[PDB]
Design a binder for this molecule. Structure first.
Ligand code: HEM
Ligand SMILES: CC1(C)O[C@]2(C)CC[C@H]1CC2
Length: 397
């Protein structure tokens, strides 16, 4: 028997702690013998679990295409995820258009805005002594930042979350497609507005950009809008939710971050290794052998980053959160030409969120009378994290 045979990133067995990590540890153990295995899920596909094997696949862009970046494919109608859904030479030209606004200097500009937002959000429930850290904080900090990056109203987060849920999880395909079509209608209106009144934001930037002398198509612009929306509302929210959950019960980790705030950035990196929400797919375009396995054109390989990030041949003591770990070359943000555009931004966001939360609410715990819930999928992490804490004071009003 093999754990690969029924591996399915949308249906990972959960342990008594509520996470898939016992299952990830068991699959990591099996991957020491068999680092790539066949899953019968989704009609049959390859599951790549060893660290060196994921590296080999993800570097081999001639055989492994980002046309398969989401598997099963995210619901984005006839549109594609810009950059993430493309291969070179096209990929490189599009990524060049937005490299500057995601540079460390450009994203550092938002540090105090995130700090103020985190505190304003905390203000909303600190007097109540209870709240869902996911829906109250982890969802809202990136949703508001992302609305700002895209030049959208920050108070409409539930609308944006409804779109992202349709893209990633709504099971009825007619419903899903129709809600994504609502995103498209809103993006069209935004694009038209920015054409006449261009702002400082990233949409305005790509709308005014040119490639090889020509302006981008509306379809390309909607692809930019969609992937940047997903990065915040999905990936970042699920990561931060998992982090808040971990800090709620792991009183040892928590006291060390409070005693040593200078270790928070390295701790964020180690939490990214351990709770990194993402996996990605690759479409096989040429016959290719990786280790013992020969893959054929039209097959898909799923890169199970959480398993590789636990590989004993790549990390010492991989099942422990070692906040001083370095160089920590985990695969949670990918590797090679598609490595996460938002890497610096999410590091700033996580550092500020953790720093301010632990400053305001150093004492808290999981609510014994409400359930936590892990969301499974290509982007996986806590969805509900009910916590309790002593009632406190607002900084404002
Ligand atoms: C914890 C949060 C995040 C995680 C774990 C994450 C993870 C990833 C991963 C694994 C990839 C590689 C894709 C591949 O190899 O096919 C990637 C690429 C990408 N990410 Fe992130 N992401 C996060 C947040 C964000 C945010 C906040 C943004 C932007 C607002 C963003 C924008 C992008 C883009 C545009 C790409 C494609 C880059 C390219 O294809 O060259 N991500 N991300
Ligand atoms: C799932 C994952 C990793 O996140 C986004 C934002 C980037 C690459 C893919 C698809 C969308």
């Amino acid at each position: 028997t093999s754990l690969f045979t029924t591996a399915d990133h949308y249906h990972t067995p959960l342990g008594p702690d509520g996470t898939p990590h016992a299952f990830f540890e068991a699959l990591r153990d099996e991957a020491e013998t068999t680092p790539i295995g066949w899953s019968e899920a989704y009609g049959g596909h390859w599951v790549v679990a060893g660290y060196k094997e994921i590296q080999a696949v993800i570097q081999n862009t001639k055989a492994f295409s980002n046309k398969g970046v989401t598997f099963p494919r995210f619901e984005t109608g006839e549109f594609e995820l810009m950059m993430a859904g493309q291969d070179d030479p096209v990929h490189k030209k599009y990524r060049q258009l937005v490299a500057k606004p995601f540079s460390p200097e450009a994203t550092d500009l938002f540090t105090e805005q995130l700090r103020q937002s985190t505190n304003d959000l905390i203000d909303a429930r600190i007097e109540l002594g209870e709240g869902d850290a996911a829906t109250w904080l982890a969802n809202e900090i990136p949703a508001r930042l992302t609305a700002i990056l895209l030049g959208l109203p920050p108070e409409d987060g539930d609308t944006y979350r409804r779109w992202v849920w349709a893209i990633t999880h709504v099971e009825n395909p007619e419903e899903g497609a129709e809600i994504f079509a609502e995103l498209v209608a809103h993006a069209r209106t935004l694009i038209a507005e920015r054409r006449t009144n261009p702002g400082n934001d990233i949409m305005s930037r790509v709308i005014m950009s040119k490639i090889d002398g020509e302006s981008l198509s509306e379809d390309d612009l909607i692809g930019f809008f969609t992937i940047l929306l997903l990065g915040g509302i999905d990936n970042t929210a699920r990561f931060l939710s998992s982090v808040f959950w971990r800090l709620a019960w792991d009183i040892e980790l928590r006291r060390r971050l409070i005693a040593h705030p200078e270790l928070i950035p390295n701790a964020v990196d180690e939490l990214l290794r351990f709770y990194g929400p993402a996996m990605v797919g690759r479409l096989v375009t040429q016959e290719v052998t990786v280790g013992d396995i020969t893959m054929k054109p039209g097959q898909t390989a799923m890169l199970w980053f959480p398993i590789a990030s636990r590989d004993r041949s790549a990390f010492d003591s991989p099942d422990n959160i070692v906040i001083e770990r370095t160089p920590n070359r985990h695969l949670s943000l990918g590797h090679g030409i598609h490595r996460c555009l938002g890497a610096h931004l999410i590091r700033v966001e996580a550092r500020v969120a953790i720093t301010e939360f632990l400053k305001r609410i150093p004492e808290f715990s999981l609510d014994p009378n409400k359930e936590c819930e892990w969301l499974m999928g290509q982007v996986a992490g806590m969805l509900h994290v009910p916590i309790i804490f002593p009632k406190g004071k607002r900084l404002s009003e």
